[PDB]
Design a protein around this ligand. Structure first.
Ligand code: OAA
Ligand code: OAA
Lengths: 437, 437
């Protein structure tokens, strides 16, 4: 007897693995895994292996798997949206949380539970309508989300003294609600900014997560909803040790609720060095669209690329911290591209940035990975579907990234992972360390 | 000729140190400071030396220094305010930023520039009047912080392409505007909340920061304006390692501006395992004040203690992260209380924990530090001056906590410290790490 619910599922899973890493730590706490050096401790933990985190692992060479589900494994193994071909993101939140690949049914449950949870508090909406147009879609988007910590069941619980065991639970209810509300506040920025006067409407609970949002933005093309579904699966989880995810993990660990703890992280994502770069290639691209002019040879186009380099600047959408190969999450976006829009002026000037850009960082050897991003090529497809307001681009990114981040958050509070308290050192005293000692 | 301005000092100071830590890493990049072990990796970076950080260092046995300045070296060598005895925190910001203890003038300078730079934008005020009474003053707080970043100069600079070199420079001006406006905002949340009705009126430019605050809080006791100067000193910096400091430092490294990058941390501090536990000694202190009753022995007091311990709970104001000793920030406030409230109920019982609690954790050795906090102590004094809404206490903290955060941040953007991209490890891949390899 009985039917579907991720909570039950978890209550079975959870323990088995508390035991499981316990035997591990019994045996191998004893183990020196890496080494800490002065360089790393000057250079922002690059290679310094700091976290445990389950909800994804990146490979330099291969990259992002999701159980070990490589995006192309997911692409075809996670369930599709009744009339489409894309990885539909309830099937992904399924995957990461349980290590299992779902039933379509067991996603429908998901959809219709999120878009049951999917109701916005008076005040949020007030505040949101008050937001001045001069205010970034993202400064906005945290402001609401940091104010959404009114609906927080966990934060409610604690202050009345829920017992340690439990913790994972209530944050299962808060998260589930936040991923649910998220979209509406995504859409409800966009529309108070860019189409400024019209309603973000109803929720058909006989729609999926992705699609509700497409409706709520006021976008009408079927095909853009496949794209949307698709972004919404590859921006999701991309290991721990990135800014946003690491933030959230961290502000997570002092037992601050998932509302507060997401919206700490989008300020993670807000960082032009984290998220903005999305938005920023097509900044450049309007910049190259002007300032180098309409139609160029790869010479002034390379002089333009030299352009910005020499001007001390930031070359977004090429290279990557730790990814030493092609981001699957480009290649991912390509085959989507080749398949609905191969006819585009910025599309194929993306198969043209596809042979010139890095090679100016090969000329340079700036940082260690010459190959394509995810920043790159998403922008180009947004425009195609007539998403053009490139500030809003990282509102999108947070919406997809909401999947990941709350995903581990449930796991850390079921796994009792303590408080994120490093050791920091001073220069002067580090000077006393290495040499003076 | 010419007069006072931290900026000028900075442009002499900054290079000297770039060069400095330059040589240092040419020689000692190659130096391994210690080890990465699996328990550290499953147990929250405990000893796991992850930073270099300037504006303060904390020793186990010794605790907080500021340059090498202990709280007591401070209490005196730092300039005090015009008929009063207390470390005046414009001289504290001074200390950290420059490496040098100030002059009373260039604290006059500092006061004066702040009380200039504390304008408040329209749209803050709107939304701060829109905050409903069942938000916390810190959910309330951040949201209006993260909005405030519309008044980010650096956030504007970057959009147009300032040069890398320049970076500290714009974050100078943003932070200074922050630490400036911040308390107007703190005060405005109190006053919307608890004082429900009345304006937060003046800023008298020839007053001091802490003074003007007390003035806008509605608080007319002279004595509470010492305690304040003082509080605001010892809640400033406590190295990098902690949540709020490390959070900012993080979202900082992502070239997100000061506002966006403070606010994230304050949720970091909003954590019950962070800052809320001011509030939650006095949480239990109404739960002493009822539930074991008015006048008790240290039996059914001890009982009291053991009861929430066995109920698995958290016991605030005792123990700590890294401090294996009696906080300087305790003994600091002790010497105050001795001088202005040796008559109190909740004082002398504030030494009534002062031989009982950790002893039951000495029964337990629950964690590794027997001697007191700062959360311990403060919150008794605060009712002593008639601040009582123990919710707000943790708004109190972040006001102080804006010094140190905006403090290091400036030195990070001038030292051009990169972006904190650590390495996260999953279980199963940890599993294949240690033992399988
Ligand atoms: O891992 C990185 O450094 C950032 C990244 O690509 C992500 O957060 O998706
Ligand atoms: O360092 C700790 O973990 C917390 C602390 O005392 C502080 O943030 O002031």
């Amino acid at each position: 007897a009985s039917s579907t619910n991720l909570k039950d599922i978890l209550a079975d899973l959870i323990p088995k693995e508390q035991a499981r890493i316990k035997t591990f730590r019994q045996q191998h706490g004893n183990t020196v895994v890496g080494q800490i050096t002065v360089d790393m401790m000057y250079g922002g933990m690059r290679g310094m292996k700091g976290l445990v985190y389950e909800t994804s692992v990146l490979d330099p060479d291969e990259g992002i798997r999701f159980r070990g589900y490589s995006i192309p494994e997911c692409q075809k193994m996670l369930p599709k949206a009744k009339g489409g071909e894309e990885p539909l993101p309830e099937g992904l939140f399924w995957l990461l949380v349980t290590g299992q690949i779902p039933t379509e049914e067991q996603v429908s449950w998901l959809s219709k539970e999120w878009a049951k949870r999917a109701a916005l508090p008076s005040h949020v909406v007030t505040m949101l309508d008050n937001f001045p147009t001069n205010l970034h879609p993202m400064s906005q988007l945290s402001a609401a989300i940091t104010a959404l910590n009114s609906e927080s069941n966990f934060a409610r619980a604690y202050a009345e003294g829920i017992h340690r065991t439990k913790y994972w639970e209530l944050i299962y209810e808060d998260c589930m609600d936040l991923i649910a509300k998220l979209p509406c506040v995504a859409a409800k920025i966009y529309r108070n900014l860019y189409r400024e006067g019209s309603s973000i409407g109803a929720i058909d609970s006989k729609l999926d997560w992705s699609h509700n949002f497409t409706n709520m933005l006021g976008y009408t093309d079927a095909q853009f909803t496949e794209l949307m579904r698709l972004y919404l699966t590859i921006h999701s989880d991309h290991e721990g040790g990135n800014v946003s995810a690491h933030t959230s993990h961290l502000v997570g660990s002092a037992l601050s609720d998932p509302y507060l703890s997401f919206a700490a992280a989008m300020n993670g994502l807000a960082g032009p060095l984290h998220g903005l770069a999305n938005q920023e290639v097509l900044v450049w691209l309007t910049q190259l669209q002007k300032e180098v002019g309409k139609d160029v040879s790869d010479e002034k186009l390379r002089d333009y690329i030299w352009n910005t380099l020499n001007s001390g600047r930031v070359v977004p959408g090429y290279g990557h911290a730790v990814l030493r190969k092609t981001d699957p999450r480009y290649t991912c976006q390509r085959e989507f591209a080749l398949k609905h829009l191969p006819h585009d002026p910025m599309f194929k000037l993306v198969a043209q940035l596809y042979k010139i850009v890095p090679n100016v960082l090969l000329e340079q050897g700036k940082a260690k990975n010459p190959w394509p991003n995810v920043d790159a090529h998403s922008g180009v497809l947004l425009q195609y579907y007539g998403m053009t307001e490139m500030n809003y681009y990282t509102v999108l990114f947070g919406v997809s990234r909401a999947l990941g981040v709350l995903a581990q958050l449930i796991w850390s509070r079921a796994l009792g992972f303590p408080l994120e308290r490093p050791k920091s050192m001073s220069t002067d005293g580090l000077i006393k360390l290495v040499d003076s000692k």
